[PDB]
C-alpha cells in the first residue's frame, strides 16, 4: 500500500506515488523527476492530474505517451495554486527537470519535499530563505559519514583531461560513456566538446535528450555513429566483453577504447583522491569508474539541514530496515544538538 512518507498531510496530495493503483483520496499526483523508481506506474492510460516541471512533462508526453490533458507543467520559482493550496517548485540539482516541492498548508504549516537532490549552498538563496519550514521530506540516499565525494567540477575536469590526453596520443582511440537513465549529461557532453566531436547514440536515447531543453543540443548529439568518436551505450554494456563486441562493430576505424562508468559512490572514495583514480585494463580496452554523484554527500546534506532547521525530518530513502532508520535518526539528533535548534 502507499507508504506514509509519500503522502502530504492536510492535502489530497501524493509525491512519486504511481505504482499503488488509485490512492484513496488523492486529488493530485506530483512527480519530482523522470527516474523509473519514481514514475513507475505511469502510461497513456493514466487519467488523474500529474503536476511536474516542463522538462518532466516533455518526457511524460514523448517517452511514456501520457495524454496531454492530464499533464500540468509548472514554472520554477513561482507561486502557484493547486486544488486550493499554494505550492512552489525549486531546482533540485539532480537530473534535468528534477524539482523539490514547497507546500503551504491552509493551517500555516510549511512542508518541503526534496524529491532526489544534491544539496548546494545556492539553495540557501532561493525562495527557501523567505520563510520557516516545519517538516522536511529528505533524500537520505547517502546519509552516513563514509559517503564523501568530490565536486562535479573536479570530476569533469579529470574526465576531460584524461580523454583529451588519450585521443591526442592515439587519434584512432574511441571514447565510450555508459548511461541507463537521464542525468549526468555533463560527463559525455564535456568530453565530446574537448574532442571536437558530437556524441553518437541510439535513436531512443537521442529522443530522450531532445526533451531536456539543453541549449544548442542539435550541435552536440547525433544518431550517426560513423561521424562520432564519443559513443553512448547502455551501462550494462560497459565491461570488457560488451566493449570488445562494440569495437568489432566499428569496422577497423578504431584500435583502442577508453570507457567511462559514472557510478554513484564506490568504496575507493574512503581512501583515494580524484587525482589518483586508475582504470581497469584488458588489452586495448581501459574502463574508468568515476564518482560523479547527483545526490548529496553526507557533509552537503548536513549543512543543508543545519541551515534549514526543520522541526521534523521524514526520510524517503533507506527506510526499509530498522538499523538504517535508527542510524539516520541518530544523525538527525546530532545535527540538531550541534546547531542548537
Ligand atoms: Ni533520481
Swiss-Prot record:
May be required for DNA interstrand cross-link repair. Also required for checkpoint mediated cell cycle arrest in early prophase in response to mitotic spindle poisons. Possesses beta-lactamase activity, catalyzing the hydrolysis of penicillin G and nitrocefin. Exhibits no activity towards other beta-lactam antibiotic classes including cephalosporins (cefotaxime) and carbapenems (imipenem). Binds constitutively to TP53BP1. Binds CDC27, which is itself a component of the anaphase promoting complex (APC). Binds PIAS1. Belongs to the DNA repair metallo-beta-lactamase (DRMBL) family. It is found in: Nucleus. Signal peptide: none annotated. Expressed in brain, heart, kidney, liver, pancreas, placenta and skeletal muscle. The chain holds residues 700 to 1040 of 1040 of the full protein. It comes from the Eukaryota. It comes from Homo sapiens (Human). This is DNA cross-link repair 1A protein. Induction: During mitosis. The mRNA encoding this protein contains an internal ribosome entry site (IRES) in its 5'-UTR. This 5'-UTR generally suppresses translation while specifically promoting expression during mitosis, when cap-dependent translation may be impaired.
